[PDB]
């Protein structure tokens, strides 16, 4: 940026690439040395690193916490700076060059150059007769003698003629020209190659520019380990069937460890983290062939359920993945080219629809692996027809609606919710109401998706990388909020928060229903009944439900998971008895509540009709509309429900009959 230019004193072209048509030839004053923003200010504004991708120096600057890397063209010519750069470019450790101090001399530049070019065997190939071609060669310490002559034969450094003799000047301070000529030879041997569009960079490289250090603690990047990662806490001496050296990989989950042999098949024991013990395990699959495609990152082609993380040379397997675990690029795609340029057009972002659930569903497919079912097509057993998971169609509900507006995407659109939150972060003190002025309903293309409820990047303490406490997550959208005692049937919408918390609001004070009606099933959470065992069907069993997932069933890309389309759970047996509490017992309460609300709404559209304006029939309409819009048949709060129906069956014979 222009700010980084001031902070560093560097030209734009130092960190940013400039078009070929701008390049200065040596001596020439091309556009790459002029004020970019004077000329581009208002004709082709420079706004993005897609226009001006980073040079190597820009990359290093950004990897160094936006501080300049050491540059031998400009910085103090210390032994330290020379080793720092010679090491970086070569990939050697800074220690392979040894102890270091003072400013660089011609003889130790020749030494560092031998290390960096890894030419110790080419330097030992010179003999005492080669050395003697030089008058002052003995004026160099023994370590640097042969190297200084090798460097002069190779032309990296020069000698000088004086009369009939040639001088190396081994103790002269190396000039900037000689350091740079040596650095260029290191750069020639290890040239910086543009990565292919399909190459992967590794999570650690992504973090070196973006940060995201808390990502390293989520379970995604930790799915696959090697045994040394666990130190000595596996208590290997208690394992009588295998040892750490028999193990190729450890499959690492929150509660259990699985172990993968040298032949990639699972091992007879698992490690139970809670009881600190080797237990027996009956997995025998080949992990590489059957499992790795969702557990690793970086192999050619699509990843996830259709992925191929290996190749098989007859009988031996070759691993094609380069990162164990689910790294950044498992969602953002191959990022090596992006990581070498900072070019946003070379990585998957929101502009590519990464927030769509498909980013996650290729591993969380919705059969054995939870999440994907939330937007699938269901055949609920005993109910004819089929139905789509309604969080999936949340947006096209607003698109298909006559009074469909932008205000509604607050709870119906993922790309609206992030767009809005971006506008409040750029224009502080502006509200939700006047962001809607900027956008038409048609701009937005996503309903509710995985990242509406889950963060892909961090765990904030709520479990399952959720953004909020589970109840608060559901209640943020399933609130009515504001509706008063005189709102009526058609004026109270999704009041689940208020019914379930038993808090209808102040204006219900006058009607004798207390400020807080404690819920007899209030020790349950929304997820207890709507998401048993982590299922995202959200359909409640009464008490049990059986679903055939037709999206799973009719998708051959799922392989052997296509046959696992049946889901079955009990929404109530955490508290109610598993066998004794049955559909008949539940149908009793549920019919009995449906009956009582219908006979309040029927005999208020029939007999008491056109009392429509009586502020005494609006009460009995609201009080019975709440039990209807809540749509739980009073299960969300059995005690608030009967106190609502009684105070509504009373308020109808307390009306003016006509
Ligand atoms: C998009 C398809 C996804 C994917 C891949 C996942 N989710 Fe969810 N999720 C939500 C809540 C409240 C929970 C906790 C459930 C509970 O308490 O039992 C979950 C759980 C998960 C899991 C873990 C499942 C388990 O075995 O316990 C996983 C792997 C997962 N999710 C992935 C909330 C929501 C949503 C709010 C309506 C949405 C949308 C999603 N999740 C979407 C997805
Ligand atoms: C290295 C010290 C830099 C110099 C000198 C200049 N830029 Fe820069 N720029 C640099 C980095 C590492 C980045 C990415 C920052 C990020 O976190 O995204 C940028 C970015 C830009 C952009 C993109 C828009 C933006 O991020 O605000 C522009 C338009 C840009 N830089 C312009 C620019 C100009 C005009 C410069 C010369 C005055 C210049 N940069 C120098 C690194 C460095
Ligand atoms: C006028 C004297 C210029 C100054 C100074 C800079 N730029 Fe330029 N730029 C200019 C023109 C007339 C054009 C269009 C013709 C062309 O050569 O393309 C451009 C184009 C660019 C682009 C377009 C993308 C591309 O062709 O690769 C970029 C990214 C660009 N210019 C960048 C750029 C930078 C970084 C500058 C400061 C070093 C700079 N321009 C100065 C005119 C002029
Ligand atoms: C410094 C050389 C970087 C490395 C290494 C990585 N990224 Fe990057 N990224 C960088 C810049 C200067 C920018 C543009 C400014 C910005 O921060 O938006 C980006 C952008 C992204 C994006 C957003 C893309 C978009 O559509 O807007 C993503 C999703 C992203 N980067 C991810 C990412 C990944 C996965 C990386 C490892 C392969 C990675 N980045 C490395 C700079 C640098
Ligand atoms: C394959 C490359 C995956 C993609 C893409 C996504 N997920 Fe994932 N996820 C995957 C595995 C193999 C695991 C188990 C990790 C382990 O070490 O046990 C997970 C885990 C999760 C979890 C559970 C986290 C927890 O606290 O237990 C969640 C909530 C989750 N994944 C969500 C999620 C989202 C939202 C994704 C899209 C942004 C996504 N995953 C993609 C495999 C893969
Ligand atoms: C799937 C489980 C993901 C993995 C692993 C990583 N990212 Fe991610 N990223 C993902 C999604 C679905 C989104 C869109 C977020 C939204 O709510 O719309 C992103 C976004 C980013 C961005 C954009 C800007 C920002 O949020 O700061 C960046 C720069 C980014 N992601 C970088 C990033 C890095 C560095 C990762 C490894 C440490 C990484 N992502 C992993 C999905 C997933
Ligand atoms: C992509 C379709 C996958 C394949 C193929 C395999 N696994 Fe998996 N696994 C996947 C996800 C998305 C998750 C987390 C989300 C969820 O619903 O569990 C997992 C999780 C595991 C775990 C941890 C379970 C736990 O108790 O938390 C284990 C131990 C595991 N997976 C093992 C495993 C094996 C043995 C596989 C081959 C038979 C296998 N997985 C394949 C995604 C995918
Ligand atoms: C969060 C506070 C919401 C806002 C703002 C809007 N809607 Fe919504 N809507 C929300 C929920 C939690 C539900 C389901 C509740 C339930 O009882 O099942 C809905 C549902 C709808 C429907 C479906 C109608 C039905 O099946 O009975 C429609 C047609 C609908 N919503 C439209 C809609 C419009 C037009 C909005 C802007 C005026 C709007 N909603 C805002 C949550 C929220
Ligand atoms: C806004 C991002 C929401 C959050 C967070 C939760 N819900 Fe939701 N839900 C929302 C809408 C807008 C709709 C209906 C839209 C439509 O197209 O009709 C729903 C739907 C439900 C349903 C009905 C599901 C069905 O019949 O298929 C249930 C049972 C439901 N929602 C429950 C629920 C739970 C338990 C939540 C926390 C885990 C939750 N919702 C969050 C909006 C949003
Ligand atoms: C068990 C005591 C439950 C708890 C806790 C919560 N819900 Fe519920 N809900 C439950 C049942 C038995 C039903 C009837 C739906 C059916 O399948 O017949 C519902 C209904 C809903 C709905 C409407 C869904 C629909 O079918 O239209 C919504 C939107 C809903 N529930 C949301 C919700 C919220 C936000 C909760 C926490 C405050 C919550 N439910 C808890 C059973 C139970
Ligand atoms: C533990 C948090 C529970 C969950 C989960 C479910 N139920 Fe429940 N229920 C629970 C208790 C402790 C009681 C008795 C309350 C008392 O103190 O008397 C109940 C009661 C019922 C009833 C009868 C209510 C009445 O006659 O007034 C019904 C019809 C009922 N429960 C249904 C029900 C269903 C269908 C559930 C799954 C969605 C469910 N409950 C879950 C505790 C808990
Ligand atoms: C729901 O969305 C799905 C997206 O993958 C898919 O498009 C699905 O297609 C239907 O599949 C269901 C079973 O899951 C039915 O087979 C449905 O059946 C047909 O519906 C069509 C027209 O609506 C067609 O005319 C068929 O004759 C009719 N069958 C019946 C019930 O008599 C499939 N649709 C098609 C186009 O084949 C989507 N289901 C929907 C939209 O209901
Ligand atoms: C290795 O990878 C293959 C998939 O690409 C197969 O999984 C193959 O399975 C085994 O096939 C061999 C012949 O190649 C035998 O017929 C085995 O019976 C069969 N596996 C089992 C246990 O039945 C895998 N091959 C190897 C070397 O395991
Ligand atoms: C439950 O709801 C009640 C009214 O509906 C009260 O708000 C009650 O709060 C408690 O009130 C009594 C006084 O009558 C005590 O003074 C308690 O200290 C007070 N609880 C606190 C500490 O706020 C509610 N009780 C609970 C525990 O939910
Ligand atoms: Ca799905």
Coordinates of N, CA and C in Angstrom, one line a residue, residues 18-88:
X18 N 4.8 -5.0 -11.8 CA 4.3 -4.0 -12.7 C 4.2 -4.6 -14.1
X19 N 3.3 -4.1 -14.9 CA 3.2 -4.7 -16.3 C 4.5 -4.6 -17.1
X20 N 4.7 -5.5 -18.0 CA 5.9 -5.5 -18.8 C 6.0 -4.2 -19.6
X21 N 4.9 -3.6 -20.0 CA 4.9 -2.3 -20.7 C 5.4 -1.1 -19.9
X22 N 5.5 -1.3 -18.5 CA 6.0 -0.3 -17.7 C 7.5 -0.4 -17.3
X23 N 8.1 -1.5 -17.7 CA 9.4 -1.8 -17.2 C 10.5 -0.8 -17.6
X24 N 11.3 -0.4 -16.7 CA 12.5 0.4 -17.0 C 13.6 -0.5 -17.4
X25 N 14.2 -0.2 -18.6 CA 15.5 -0.8 -18.9 C 16.6 0.0 -18.1
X26 N 17.7 -0.6 -17.9 CA 18.8 0.1 -17.1 C 19.1 1.4 -17.7
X27 N 19.0 2.5 -16.9 CA 19.1 3.9 -17.3 C 17.9 4.5 -17.7
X28 N 16.9 3.8 -18.2 CA 15.6 4.4 -18.6 C 14.7 4.7 -17.4
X29 N 13.9 5.7 -17.6 CA 12.9 6.1 -16.6 C 11.5 5.7 -17.1
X30 N 11.2 4.4 -16.9 CA 9.9 3.9 -17.3 C 8.9 4.2 -16.2
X31 N 7.6 3.7 -16.5 CA 6.5 4.0 -15.6 C 6.7 3.2 -14.3
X32 N 7.4 2.1 -14.3 CA 7.6 1.3 -13.0 C 8.3 2.1 -11.9
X33 N 8.9 3.3 -12.3 CA 9.6 4.1 -11.3 C 8.9 5.4 -11.1
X34 N 7.7 5.6 -11.6 CA 6.9 6.8 -11.5 C 5.8 6.7 -10.5
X35 N 5.1 7.8 -10.2 CA 4.0 7.8 -9.2 C 2.8 7.0 -9.8
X36 N 2.6 5.8 -9.4 CA 1.5 5.0 -10.0 C 0.2 5.7 -9.8
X37 N -0.1 6.2 -8.6 CA -1.5 6.7 -8.3 C -1.8 8.1 -8.9
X38 N -0.8 8.8 -9.4 CA -1.1 10.0 -10.1 C -1.8 9.7 -11.4
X39 N -1.3 8.6 -12.1 CA -1.7 8.4 -13.5 C -2.9 7.5 -13.5
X40 N -2.9 6.5 -12.5 CA -4.0 5.6 -12.4 C -5.2 6.0 -11.5
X41 N -5.0 7.1 -10.7 CA -5.9 7.7 -9.8 C -7.4 7.6 -10.2
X42 N -7.7 7.8 -11.5 CA -9.1 8.0 -11.9 C -9.2 7.6 -13.3
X43 N -8.5 6.5 -13.7 CA -8.6 6.0 -15.1 C -8.6 4.4 -15.0
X44 N -7.7 3.9 -14.3 CA -7.7 2.4 -14.0 C -7.2 2.3 -12.5
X45 N -8.0 2.6 -11.5 CA -7.5 2.6 -10.1 C -6.9 1.3 -9.7
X46 N -5.8 1.4 -9.0 CA -5.2 0.2 -8.4 C -5.8 -0.1 -7.0
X47 N -6.6 -1.2 -7.0 CA -7.4 -1.5 -5.8 C -7.0 -2.8 -5.2
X48 N -6.3 -3.7 -5.8 CA -6.2 -5.1 -5.5 C -4.9 -5.7 -5.9
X49 N -4.4 -6.7 -5.2 CA -3.2 -7.4 -5.6 C -3.5 -8.4 -6.7
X50 N -4.8 -8.4 -7.2 CA -5.0 -9.1 -8.5 C -4.5 -8.3 -9.6
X51 N -4.5 -7.0 -9.5 CA -3.8 -6.1 -10.5 C -2.3 -6.1 -10.3
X52 N -1.9 -5.9 -9.1 CA -0.5 -5.7 -8.8 C -0.1 -6.9 -7.8
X53 N 0.2 -8.1 -8.3 CA 0.6 -9.2 -7.4 C 1.9 -8.9 -6.8
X54 N 2.2 -9.6 -5.6 CA 3.4 -9.3 -4.9 C 4.6 -9.9 -5.5
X55 N 5.8 -9.2 -5.4 CA 7.0 -9.8 -5.8 C 7.5 -10.7 -4.6
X56 N 8.7 -11.3 -4.8 CA 9.2 -12.1 -3.7 C 9.4 -11.2 -2.5
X57 N 9.9 -10.0 -2.7 CA 10.2 -9.1 -1.6 C 8.9 -8.7 -0.9
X58 N 7.8 -8.6 -1.7 CA 6.5 -8.3 -1.1 C 6.0 -9.5 -0.2
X59 N 6.1 -10.7 -0.8 CA 5.8 -11.9 0.0 C 6.5 -12.0 1.3
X60 N 7.9 -11.8 1.2 CA 8.7 -11.9 2.4 C 8.3 -10.8 3.4
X61 N 8.1 -9.6 2.9 CA 7.6 -8.5 3.8 C 6.3 -8.9 4.5
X62 N 5.4 -9.5 3.8 CA 4.1 -9.9 4.5 C 4.3 -11.1 5.4
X63 N 5.1 -12.1 5.0 CA 5.4 -13.2 5.9 C 6.2 -12.8 7.2
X64 N 6.9 -11.6 7.1 CA 7.7 -11.1 8.2 C 6.9 -10.2 9.1
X65 N 5.5 -10.3 9.2 CA 4.7 -9.4 9.9 C 4.8 -8.0 9.4
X66 N 4.8 -7.9 8.1 CA 4.9 -6.6 7.4 C 6.1 -5.8 7.9
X67 N 7.3 -6.5 7.9 CA 8.6 -5.8 8.1 C 9.5 -6.3 7.0
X68 N 10.4 -5.5 6.5 CA 11.2 -5.8 5.4 C 12.2 -7.0 5.7
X69 N 12.3 -7.9 4.8 CA 13.3 -8.9 4.9 C 14.7 -8.3 4.7
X70 N 15.7 -9.0 5.1 CA 17.1 -8.6 4.8 C 17.4 -8.6 3.3
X71 N 17.9 -7.5 2.8 CA 18.2 -7.4 1.4 C 19.6 -6.9 1.2
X72 N 20.4 -7.8 0.6 CA 21.9 -7.6 0.4 C 22.1 -6.4 -0.5
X73 N 21.1 -6.0 -1.3 CA 21.3 -4.8 -2.1 C 21.4 -3.5 -1.3
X74 N 20.9 -3.5 -0.1 CA 20.8 -2.3 0.7 C 21.3 -2.4 2.1
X75 N 21.3 -3.5 2.8 CA 21.4 -3.6 4.2 C 22.9 -3.7 4.6
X76 N 23.2 -3.5 5.9 CA 24.6 -3.7 6.4 C 25.2 -5.0 6.0
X77 N 26.4 -4.9 5.5 CA 27.2 -6.1 5.0 C 27.9 -6.9 6.1
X78 N 27.0 -7.3 7.1 CA 27.6 -8.2 8.1 C 27.6 -9.6 7.7
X79 N 28.4 -10.4 8.4 CA 28.3 -11.9 8.2 C 26.9 -12.4 8.5
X80 N 26.3 -11.8 9.5 CA 24.9 -12.2 9.8 C 24.0 -12.0 8.7
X81 N 23.9 -10.8 8.1 CA 23.0 -10.6 7.0 C 23.3 -11.5 5.8
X82 N 24.5 -11.7 5.5 CA 24.9 -12.6 4.4 C 24.4 -14.0 4.6
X83 N 24.6 -14.5 5.9 CA 24.2 -15.9 6.2 C 22.7 -16.0 6.2
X84 N 22.0 -14.9 6.7 CA 20.6 -14.9 6.8 C 19.9 -15.1 5.4
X85 N 20.5 -14.4 4.4 CA 20.0 -14.5 3.1 C 20.5 -15.7 2.3
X86 N 21.8 -16.0 2.5 CA 22.3 -17.2 1.9 C 21.6 -18.5 2.4
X87 N 21.3 -18.5 3.7 CA 20.5 -19.6 4.2 C 19.1 -19.7 3.7
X88 N 18.4 -18.5 3.7 CA 17.0 -18.5 3.2 C 16.9 -19.0 1.8

